Amino acid sequence: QCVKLNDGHFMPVLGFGTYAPAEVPKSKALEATKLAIEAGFRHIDSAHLYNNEEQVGLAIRSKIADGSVKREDIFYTSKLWCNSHRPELVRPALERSLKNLQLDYVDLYLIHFPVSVKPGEEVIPKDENGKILFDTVDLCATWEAVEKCKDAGLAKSIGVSNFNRRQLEMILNKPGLKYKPVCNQVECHPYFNQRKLLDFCKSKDIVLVAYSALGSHREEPWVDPNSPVLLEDPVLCALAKKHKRTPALIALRYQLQRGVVVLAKSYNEQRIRQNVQVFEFQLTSEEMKAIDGLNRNVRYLTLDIFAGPPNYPFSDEY
Ligand SMILES: NC(=O)c1ccc[n+]([C@@H]2O[C@H](COP(=O)([O-])OP(=O)(O)OC[C@H]3O[C@@H](n4cnc5c(N)ncnc54)[C@H](OP(=O)(O)O)[C@@H]3O)[C@@H](O)[C@H]2O)c1
Ligand SMILES: COc1ccc(Cl)cc1C(=O)NCCc1ccc(S(=O)(=O)NC(=O)NC2CCCCC2)cc1
């Protein structure tokens, strides 16, 4: 189930998505993650932003106490939110995520999003006129404090999320660079297959990590509800009939076959169990290219509110 990272560590190819909109009680974060560990997920993806590291952490700690796993067997990811991009604030944010988790280390720590916001207790601080209180932080600086987190052994591996190509290049080109990003976690599914970005990532030994791989939570205002529903796709449905699987499984399996590490969120016990069956069938080259034909360039997570500053990552082609 694993891919070797460029820092020598191993990342399982299928990960469990822990985000659910806040209308869903956080108690389900805990139940769901235990079920995911139980169903066989070994890679668990969260963030400070998701406001669930207490529950996800307990979940993980719970499955260790009952003997179902040891900590060595779990790959846990957290992410540095945008109000702690200032170097001095990077270590304390990771430490805060760990105290909440009640874990000594994270397996992977990402720069969640490349646009910095004003420090403070507000998640997305805005003025009363209109806009987000953007901050001026050198990402190359932010990264260096992220590397210090690897040196301190708080994070076993480090990487980025929602970086475009120039931003990845930027880190690669940085004088003094200690560690490459192990990964770039981005939106990827058959309506936005990220081919160019995926190729660039492979040409530089960076794991692309597909999120919203099942077509997103569709939570407003983060997703246009007029957007097409990925899992209703006729071809994904056909391939599912043909393989006696589901459109979800087709869509997950697509990513495994093109060397993409794939996340799937589910709080449903059935669909949690179903999702691990990505390791029990496979697609033909002809099928896989059928799925390449589904490319719509429909980006579910535009993150428009962050547009404006130069580091808004989706202005560039890729
Ligand atoms: N910037 C970032 O780094 C970023 C951005 C977005 C997401 N993420 C990460 O990616 C994870 C997942 O992304 P996401 O939640 O946006 O979308 P997603 O996992 O692609 O889509 C999940 C949706 O599909 C449903 N589902 C799951 N399994 C299914 C199946 N077998 N059949 C039918 N439906 C199924 C889920 O519902 P049920 O729960 O009802 O089953 C949920 O509504 C998040 O938890 C987070 O960890 C990261
Ligand atoms: C302004 O809001 C808040 C104010 C107060 C509190 Cl108490 C919580 C929030 C909050 O939590 N609001 C974000 C809600 C949210 C979380 C996860 C997802 S997600 O798409 O599943 N995962 C991601 O990382 N999404 C993106 C990536 C980076 C840019 C923005 C988040 C989608 C949306």
- Rounded CA-CA distance 277/128 in Å is 49
Q: Which of 217, 222, 311 to mutate to test the pocket of ligand 2 (most atoms within 8 A of CB)?
A: 222
Taking CA atoms only, the protein residue closest to ligand 2 atom 30 is: 303
Structure-token pair, residue 88: 């001095």
Experimental method: X-ray
The gap from C-alpha 43 to its chain's centroid, in whole angstroms, comes to 11
- Rounded CA-CA distance 65/313 in Å is 41
Query: What is the residue range of 33's domain?
Result: 1-318
Q: What is the CATH classification number for the domain harbouring 307?
A: 3.20.20.100
β-bridge mates for residue 16, sequence order: 44, 264
142 neighbors 111 (Cβ within 8 angstroms): yes
Cα–Cα distances (Å) from 176 to 3, 145, 147, 172, 275, in that order, read: 27, 13, 11, 10, 42
- Rounded CA-CA distance 249/253 in Å is 6
Number of domains in the chain: 1
Expressed in angstroms, the distance from the first to the final Cα of the chain is 28
Ligand of minimum distance to the alpha carbon of 265: 1
- Rounded CA-CA distance 79/159 in Å is 9
DSSP 305: G
DSSP 126: B
Q: Is the dihedral of CA 74, 59, 32, 122 positive or negative?
A: negative
Assess whether 50 carries a catalytic annotation.
yes
76 neighbors 44 (Cβ within 8 angstroms): yes
Taking CA atoms only, the protein residue closest to ligand 2 atom 21 is: 19
Whether omega for the bond prior to residue 221 falls within 30 degrees of 0, making it cis, is yes
Structure-token pair, residue 53: 């590291």
Check pocket membership of 50 for ligand 2, CB cut-off 6 A.
yes
